[PDB]
RNA sequence: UCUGAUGGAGGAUCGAGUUGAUACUGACGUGCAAAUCGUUCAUUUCAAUCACGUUUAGGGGCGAAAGACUAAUCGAAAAG
RNA sequence: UUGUGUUGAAGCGAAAUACGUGAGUUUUCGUGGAACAUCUCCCUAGUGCAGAUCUUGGUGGAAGUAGCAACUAUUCAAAU
RNA sequence: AGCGUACCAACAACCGCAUCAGGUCUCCAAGGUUAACAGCCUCUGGUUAAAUAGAAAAAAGUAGGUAAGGGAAGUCGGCAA
RNA sequence: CUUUUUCGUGAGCUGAGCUGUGAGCUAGGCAAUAGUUCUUUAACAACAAAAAAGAGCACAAACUGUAGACGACUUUUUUGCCUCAGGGUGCUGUAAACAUGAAAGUAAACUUUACGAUCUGUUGAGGCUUAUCCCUAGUGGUAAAGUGU
């Protein structure tokens, strides 16, 4: 039952996909890199943040997202996803 | 009928089967003819391809267009950290080829070494050459002994230092390097005094000497004819489609012959290619390996922003005019020519005006990020 | 006779739609389809296009004529 | 004419120290659950199949294959 | 007075053997750009559905793009562009 | 089998004695029997049981991309690797904002105020840069432990 606040590098995942796909690839792989990161089957992402990744439409979703995990308890444990806001994407890692 | 109009067949037959190779390093199919009045000496040496870059030369070909005048060449990088011997093995002739008789260790091997022979090294016990090493010296010298009085090759077992490169990798590559030179008396001594310490490239090869490079070619996956063997397209009007060979065979014999190019696997093919000159060997300790005494600037081979896909080379390398197959971290195994050569290229004694080290990403202006800073002046 | 306007004729022109079908001899050709799809092309005030109704029936009809069409059937329909 | 069947007929599957040269005949076991044979002699015919792009029905290898391709495009969360 | 009055009108309700990219008559007809009821984008209304999805992404196919220098030498023919 | 013995080799003992083994010497008596043959059950190798003595890897997984249609192949799995960040190297071309800043000109008050394509300064800025670029024991992480032998 811990929180992380980490940054994704969307370029580099949606990199080679085209442009039809470019959103929903991007969801994608932000649903499987908080399933690893957390070890939960049950990733759950916030509706804010599926707003926020096709903001700017289906060709080009933002370079990188700000996002927040946090594991629940409630097979059992499951993780939420939830955007971030920041101004800038510089200088900040990734914290527990 | 006969053709209405020859023309060469696509492709060489001699290169068949293109199919993938077996390994990715490369094999040495046959070492240089030995010749017993030279000392004993080595005849292979295992390095990596880091990139490649141009430089510099004047020309001393008399009666050439080009002759007094500064040409630029291109030049591949080779990094070649010292190699490690750690074995011999000895062989004999028989009617059947070449038989092993015994291959004797050294007393310790590097844990590089022995990761080659895992495939899991990270969850096993790390047991591999524990406890053969400590074998008495006795039945080491009697192997010997018997290597003296029998076999008629000798070769030494020596290893690459993947840790001294930027490779993910960390299994050392182990092949074996032919010793070409007196009798099996000074062989087996030759090797038994350098049976642990390190084999720098300088031991091996000479500045400005041809060698022959063996390595895999750059992969492409299966490929379709006109790529592969260069047939030439169809007309546009075909109907279903251009990029195929238009007969593969007359109607007799009722097969299709192995002469027909087809589509299939391009690349990650052996070669082994011959006359490549060494420019330079470059030595890890100086500070101006990349730098010529036309330039006397202080600078490394490595150039600003690092060998694309590669890294930075900071051990001992080589300077081999032209290209060499193989992708960047490629193993290129050296090689020294199976005949000594007397032509004037070979012989040549090759002057460096100038090594370039601009980036090799972009097109970069200048050979040093000092000078870039200079340039630029004070920025945010 | 010449000049400028006005005027708005024509089986006049371009061109969507409509009506067709030149070419790719493209796709498909075990098709979406027993004739389609894409691009290209012809046609648009008239010998124009469409609908419904109505007439003409088989050695007969109908034909700006191709042995065309007459219910996927035509150098003699289809059913018994 | 003279026989066999609920103490199991016809049929069917596998067979047999079986007979025949052979079409076949006869037996055993199992299944079956209601009829069957007559070679004593004869009468009668819609009476004998490997094929006919045979007819009807059933079933294969192909093969978990060809393929499920027009119409730009889906995503997050919740309910059932 | 009597009879019709629901619904589809094709996108799966019609005809094509079908829930078939085909065919099948009529009326209403917004904004911007513009000559324009063209093309392209948009508001009202409608939809986000198509005999499937996911991943990978090589050959080959198909529908397109772009190509130095030359410019029809290609080819029956400048077919296609 | 018993007696007399002669000569060679193994265990144990200290080039050397003894025991056993092999061959022989002198002397003695001691057995074979299945009805006429049905292969003369006779070799070699292996195995099973019971006694006595001595005696780890690989796949999968995650990662990689020097590889690739799928398999396969190259790697790494805690000085590594992945991740983000910082730096390098490049690509583009000077971001948003502000400026009694400029601007061809215009109009509106008793000299200033409004509109203005565009330009200038802060600004070689801003953005992007491996996904198959380079460096960093920089941040965070590195998971269940399944299958075969």
């Known amino acids: ?21 470019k959103a929903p690839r991007a969801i994608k792989e932000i649903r499987s890199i908080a399933g690893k990161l957390m070890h939960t089957k049950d990733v759950r992402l916030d509706v804010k943040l599926n707003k926020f990744i096709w903001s700017k439409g289906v060709r080009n979703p933002p370079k990188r997202v700000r996002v927040k995990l946090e594991r629940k308890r409630n097979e ?21 | 009928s006969h053709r209405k109009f020859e ?25 240089p003819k030995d010749d017993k009045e030279k000392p004993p000496h080595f005849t292979a040496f295992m390095g990596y ?36 011997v750690v074995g011999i093995v000895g062989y004999r002739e028989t009617p059947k080829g070449l038989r092993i008789l015994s291959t004797v260790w050294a007393n310790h091997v590097s844990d590089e ?30 192997l010997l002994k018997r290597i003296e009085k029998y076999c008629t090759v000798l070769r030494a077992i020596c290893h690459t230092q993947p840790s001294k490169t930027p490779l993910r990798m960390k299994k050392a590559h182990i092949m074996e390097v032919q010793i070409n030179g007196g009798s099996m008396k000074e062989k087996l001594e030759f090797v038994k005094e350098m049976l642990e310490k390190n084999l ?14 063996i390595s895999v070619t750059k992969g492409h996956g299966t490929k379709g004819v006109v790529s592969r063997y260069g047939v030439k397209r169809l007309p546009r009007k075909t109907h279903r489609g251009l990029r195929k060979v238009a007969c593969i065979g007359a109607w ?129």
């Open chain 1, 1 to 21: 039952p811990v929180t992380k606040f980490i940054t994704i590098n969307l370029s580099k995942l949606t990199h080679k996909v085209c442009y039809k796909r």
């Open chain 1, 76 to 96: 059992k444990m499951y993780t939420i996803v939830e955007h971030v806001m920041v101004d800038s994407y510089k200088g900040l890692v990734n914290e527990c």
């Open chain 2, 7 to 31: 023309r060469p067949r696509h492709g060489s037959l001699g290169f068949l089967p293109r199919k993938r190779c077996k390994r990715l390093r490369g094999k040495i199919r046959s070492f």
């Open chain 2, 49 to 84: 391809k880091a990139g490649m870059t141009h430089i510099v030369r004047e020309v001393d070909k008399p009666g050439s267009k080009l002759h007094k005048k500064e040409i630029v060449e291109a030049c591949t990088i080779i990094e070649c950290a010292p190699m490690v």
């Open chain 2, 113 to 142: 070494f022995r990761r080659r022979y895992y495939k899991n090294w990270y969850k096993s016990e790390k047991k591999a050459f524990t406890k053969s090493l400590n074998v008495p010296e006795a039945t080491k010298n009697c």
């Open chain 2, 200 to 213: 720098p490239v300088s031991t091996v090869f000479n500045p400005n000497e041809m060698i022959d490079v």
């Open chain 2, 252 to 380: 007799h014999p009722a097969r299709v012959q192995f002469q027909i190019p087809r589509h299939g696997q391009k690349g990650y093919f052996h070669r082994t290619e011959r006359n490549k000159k060494i420019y330079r060997i470059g030595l890890k300790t100086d500070k101006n390996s990349a730098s010529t005494d036309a330039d006397i600037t202080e600078k490394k081979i490595t150039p600003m922003g690092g060998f694309p896909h590669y890294g930075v080379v900071n051990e001992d390398f080589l300077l081999l005019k032209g290209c060499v197959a193989g992708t960047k971290k490629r193993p290129i195994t050296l090689r020294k020519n199976i005949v000594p050569q007397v032509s004037r290229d070979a012989l040549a004694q090759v002057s460096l005006k100038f090594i370039d080290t601009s980036s090799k990403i972009g097109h970069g202006r200048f050979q040093t990020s000092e000078e870039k800073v200079k340039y630029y002046g004070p920025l945010k």
